[PDB]
């Protein structure tokens, strides 16, 4: 059993590992962006609620009960 003249199997494994690492990088980036957008939407809804409350308060003052 002589020494291997080629390293094809190791290269294939390395190819798979590199592709997997790239996939992990992309997934992490996408997850971070999704979390940022979720937080942004939550803030937008909170601001809308605050604006509605302010409008209701002004209408209540106009009612003058």
């Amino acid at each position: 059993k002589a020494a291997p003249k080629t390293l094809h199997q190791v290269r294939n494994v390395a190819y798979f590992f590199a592709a997997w690492l790239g996939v992990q990088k992309g997934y992490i980036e996408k997850s971070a962006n999704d979390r940022l957008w979720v937080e942004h939407q939550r803030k937008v809804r909170q601001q809308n609620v605050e604006r509605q409350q302010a409008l209701d308060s002004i209408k209540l003052m106009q009612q003058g009960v």
């Binding site: 390395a14 592709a19 690492l21 790239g22 992309g26």
Partner: protein
């Protein structure tokens, strides 16, 4: 519609007869006599061999890992090995980039909500895409 088909068939037949490979010609003759498909048989043979060589691949992988780790690979390092390693590195880099693109499912990085480019997303001609 028919003359073109006949011409293509004739050209393929001429090319098939032209090749001077004894094994290929023998297999073609045997399959024609039996009426079977040679290409499909070759595909099945290759798949069977690969299925039977999986653990051989594993053993070769471990042997190559030992050969590299032992330092014997670098002892006889030559320019040809350098060329192969450069090819290997290039494939690794391109695979990493492709993997990142697929992982984020987008060619370009996604735009953050605080970025000024959000307007572009709002002004898409076709929101479906």
């Amino acid at each position: 519609l028919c003359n073109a088909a006949s011409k293509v068939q004739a050209r393929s037949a001429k090319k098939l007869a032209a090749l001077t490979d004894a094994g290929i010609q023998k297999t073609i003759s045997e399959h024609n006599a039996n009426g079977t498909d040679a290409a499909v048989s070759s595909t099945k043979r290759y798949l069977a061999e690969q299925r039977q060589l999986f653990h051989y691949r594993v053993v070769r992988f471990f042997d190559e890992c030992h050969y590299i780790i032992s330092g014997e690979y670098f002892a006889q390092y030559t320019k040809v090995n350098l060329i192969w390693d450069l090819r290997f590195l290039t494939k690794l880099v391109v695979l990493f980039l492709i993997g990142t693109v697929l992982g984020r499912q987008s060619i370009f990085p996604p735009i953050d909500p605080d970025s000024p480019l959000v307007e572009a997303l709002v002004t898409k001609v076709n929101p479906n895409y």
